[PDB]
Amino acid sequence: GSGYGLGLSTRTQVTGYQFLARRTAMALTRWRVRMEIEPGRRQTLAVVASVSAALVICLGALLW
Amino acid sequence: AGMAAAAHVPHTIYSPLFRKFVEWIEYLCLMPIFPLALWLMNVYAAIRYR
């Protein structure tokens, strides 16, 4: 009980946890949770796009 | 390290994202066995130099 250990988990629970984390992170920096727009994700995707763009140029150079 | 993990894992809590991550390690380990064993048996070089 109490969720101790390393038991398996459902994909619904994975996004469930990940949602509560985003909401709490927003509370520490913006002191509000209305979240009319969610800038937390938008700022993260721009980083993922930069890393992905860099790797694509490496594949191009490796293929050359 | 095994004894250390054996003593601490049963009384701690881990979030769903980490439990899902330890699960996928098994599948990531199974997939490379066949491609690697055939490489060790030299099959890819044997066929390419038929």
Swiss-Prot record, chain A:
Residues 1-46 are cytoplasmic. The chain crosses the membrane at residues 47-64. Signal peptide: none annotated. It is found in: Cell inner membrane. Belongs to the EccB family. Part of the eccB5-eccC5 operon, which is essential for in vitro growth. An ATPase (shown for residues 80-506). Part of the ESX-5 specialized secretion system, which is responsible for the secretion of EsxN and a number of PE_PGRS and PPE proteins, including PPE41. Part of the ESX-5 / type VII secretion system (T7SS), which is composed of cytosolic and membrane components. The ESX-5 membrane complex is composed of EccB5, EccC5, EccD5 and EccE5. This is ESX-5 secretion system ATPase EccB5. The lineage of its organism: Bacteria, Bacillati, Actinomycetota, Actinomycetes, Mycobacteriales. The chain holds residues 10 to 73 of 506 of the full protein.
UniProtKB/Swiss-Prot annotation, chain B:
It is found in: Cell inner membrane. Disulfide bonds: none annotated. Disruption phenotype: Mutants are defective in the secretion of EsxN, PPE41 and PE_PGRS proteins. Mutant is highly sensitive to detergents and hydrophilic antibiotics such as ampicillin, vancomycin and bacitracin. Virulence is attenuated both in macrophages and in the severe combined immune-deficient mouse infection model. The chain crosses the membrane at residues 27-47. Part of the ESX-5 / type VII secretion system (T7SS), which is composed of cytosolic and membrane components. The ESX-5 membrane complex is composed of EccB5, EccC5, EccD5 and EccE5. Was identified as a high-confidence drug target. Part of the ESX-5 specialized secretion system, which is responsible for the secretion of EsxN and a number of PE_PGRS and PPE proteins, including PPE41. Belongs to the EccD/Snm4 family. This is ESX-5 secretion system protein EccD5. It comes from Mycobacterium tuberculosis (strain ATCC 25618 / H37Rv). The lineage of its organism: Bacteria, Bacillati, Actinomycetota, Actinomycetes, Mycobacteriales. The chain holds residues 454 to 503 of 503 of the full protein.
